[PDB]
Amino acid sequence: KITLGVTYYKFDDNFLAGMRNDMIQIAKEKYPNIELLNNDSQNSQSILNDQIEVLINKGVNVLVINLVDPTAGQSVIDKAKAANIPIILFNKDPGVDALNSYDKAWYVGTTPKDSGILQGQVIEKAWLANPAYDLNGDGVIQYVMLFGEPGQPDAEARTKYSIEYLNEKGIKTEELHKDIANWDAAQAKDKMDAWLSGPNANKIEVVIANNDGMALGAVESIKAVKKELPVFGVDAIQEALTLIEKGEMVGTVLQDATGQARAILELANNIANGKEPTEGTEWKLIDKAVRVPYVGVDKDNYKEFQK
Ligand SMILES: OC[C@H]1O[C@@H](O)[C@H](O)[C@@H](O)[C@H]1O
Ligand SMILES: [Ca+2]
Ligand code: NA
Secondary structure (H helix, E strand, O other): OOOEEEOOOOOHHHHHHHHHHHHHHHHOOOOOOOOEEEEEOOOOOOHHHHHHHHHHHHHOOEEEOOOOOOOOHHHHHHHHHHHHOOOEEEOOOOOHHHOOOOEEEEEEEEHHHHHHHHHOOOOOEEEEEEHHHHHOOOOOOEEEEEEEOOOOHHHHHHHHHHHHHHHOOOOOOEEEEEOOOOOOOHHHHHHHHHHHOOOHHHHHHHHEEEEHHHHHHHHHHHOOOOOOOOOOOOOHHHHHEEEEEEEEOOEEEEEEEHHHHHHHHHHHHHHHHHOOOOOOOOOEEEEOEEOOEEEEEEEOOOOHHHH
């Protein structure tokens, strides 16, 4: 058999929970010779470090690692190298220097700039179609920004490029608030409650979140005070598609969890068997990474992605 030691920074992360289910299913359906050892790092890099050691000692064929601390890539790769076991990092990108430090390191993820641009496009379309969104009539989008995880490039890229896209198309924006909620619905709900209970809550026209999980929390907060505000996320998790169906979210951006899970399995299968990681697959490694594209989602196409 081939054994993959797979770690997830925490099990309640919505997007990664979907990917974990996908990987389990694909492995069962297509790879009878692969065994998955799944690990929950409890949002602790120290727990992850110990888990990596356990998996090394158990002699897994490939380490498949999701960083807890998004800056800890070099240390994790160093452990794999010292153990002489190949490593595929996923979802939290350790950067090129770290990947280049080990001949048996690879990465599967995305180019989050592209998701920021798509989110901007989704917002632009909805904004233009709904003049009522512009509550103060100034032509400017007064927004709040729910930022994900500091140091995880998906967060800064979605924050930067969504707004830059809008401005590039001649749509003025004004940031009323921006705060960190770490991909988490409950944290986002708390932040949104603070914003909606503030003296100037009325100024908010658009809610932008770096992921769907935080958008879910924002929606709970908005519903409680009986307001109607357009909310945008990223991932197209099923819960968000349902909110779009219900008219409680306006848009998101599909992040392809199934494709990422498939890439991890296909690359790991090759790596474990002395084959070039992309052999017999659709994937291209650019600077040792697979970058799986995103898709913009709104009321007009969300049905295509429901399961
Ligand atoms: O690093 C974990 C995060 O990764 C992002 O790509 C995703 O949009 C978030 O929902 C969360 O899963
Ligand atoms: Ca306005
Ligand atoms: Na992990």
